[PDB]
């Protein structure tokens, strides 16, 4: 098309179960999620205290194609690694 779809950039916090959770597996499983209109971006592991680190990961979504509710629920199916997800920030593009 000559005109582009509406997009948002979202930073997700993905929290582990404890300080021993395999974080590389956790982010690999997030990045394996494929949805039309979803682009994974940069990520870092960020200390939150007491030796726990959260995954902070960017993604870019086409508003009309990618439900953020659905994406969070999908990430949370990795119950062996993921305790919860939260939206750290989000912006229009």
């Amino acid at each position: 098309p000559a005109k582009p779809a509406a997009k948002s950039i979202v930073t997700l916090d993905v929290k582990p179960w404890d300080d021993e959770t395999n974080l590389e597996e956790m982010v690999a499983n997030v990045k394996a999620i494929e949805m039309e209109g979803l682009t994974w971006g940069a990520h870092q592991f960020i200390p939150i205290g007491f030796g726990i680190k959260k995954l902070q990961i960017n993604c870019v979504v086409e508003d009309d194609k990618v439900s953020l509710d659905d994406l969070q629920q999908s990430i949370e199916e990795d119950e062996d690694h993921v305790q919860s997800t939260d939206i750290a920030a989000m912006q229009k593009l």
């Binding site: 509406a6 682009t39 200390p47 007491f50 960017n58 508003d63 439900s67 953020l68 305790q83």
Partner: protein
Amino acid sequence: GKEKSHINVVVIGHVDSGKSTTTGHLIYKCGGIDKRTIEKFEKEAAELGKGSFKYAWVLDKLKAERERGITIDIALWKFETPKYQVTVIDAPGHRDFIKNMITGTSQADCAILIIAGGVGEFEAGISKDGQTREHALLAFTLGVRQLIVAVNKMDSVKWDESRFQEIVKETSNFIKKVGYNPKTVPFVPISGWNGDNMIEATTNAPWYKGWEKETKAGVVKGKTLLEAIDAIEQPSRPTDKPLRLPLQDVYKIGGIGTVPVGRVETGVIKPGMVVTFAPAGVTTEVKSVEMHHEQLEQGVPGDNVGFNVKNVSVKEIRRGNVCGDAKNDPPKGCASFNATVIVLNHPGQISAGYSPVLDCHTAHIACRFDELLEKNDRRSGKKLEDHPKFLKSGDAALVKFVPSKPMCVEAFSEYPPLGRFAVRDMRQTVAVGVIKSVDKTXXXXXXXX
């Protein structure tokens, strides 16, 4: 550089308003987000001629680079004014942003409404059913009482004074119907693309004398959008209110024990305080508090902290419970609460007995619309009828809610982050609520077992 106070701003407007270029320009020239990418494109821009470049061209390339997924910085964006460090949201069009605006972290202190000046684009942006009006209504309902209007694309209407005046008139009508007082609102003619009246004053409008706003102490005037943002009035932070800390997560850490994590919403948490977790009513001492890399002597409103407590298992407290000070208005579960509900546009009508999920702070609980007590005039609160039989889009109503699971909430007047909520249904937020009253509250642990 001097020490700054912190404020939150949300930027709203129609897809053709240019609000992303406008917000991007402020962050570029007054902040430090994705600066390595900025620097890459400033150098690349030499290719367009002999070295000169437009900020808007760099912003366009930064946007494309973000779309590729290869920029580094997260979506938490900030910039400086003389007085403030501003955390800014260029409001997404995403429909899941509505819940995030209601229950997400930090309400805005000021909304900035960006208006396209062109004739067709202006009219499109003030539609009663448009996303822009909904964002404005949500901000107003949530207590964002400060507003700035920027009339963008002034180049496209040749910086014509009459056109600006007519836009100000029509936009004043638009925002008054939402509920804002236009006399308190600066109207700034800008060009987000060319920088006019963004950080430096325009030379394209000799008629332009500046913006003004009435405040409680007098009339404040300026020329630029940056000046209007700097003139945002310092909000009061709830440092001295009693502690409220809704839980996001709870960890069991070997050698440490139970570590709840959450945002301090009101009050302050310190090692050595005795705290209570609602709705369970477990009480214990705070052993230590940590945030990011540091151990804290106190966590203050806005801090996302972990803290270690003893004699509480990870199984007796959970996400959505609320931690507060046992010594100072401790939090409690409720039997019911009454709230003013604003019904958003959605394909339905609401009768007593409706039981959707409510999101309130970190709680996610289905609550019955037990009684529809009043319908009200939205802006004034005046009661229009007792016991309406249904609610439709646009209605404001007092509703009695009964939570389906134990739930800790507060009146919005007392603890605002625990007194606003989103109602979810049909894959959208269908209503926003502001809590007006709460009906708050032994079984031994041996007896429970």
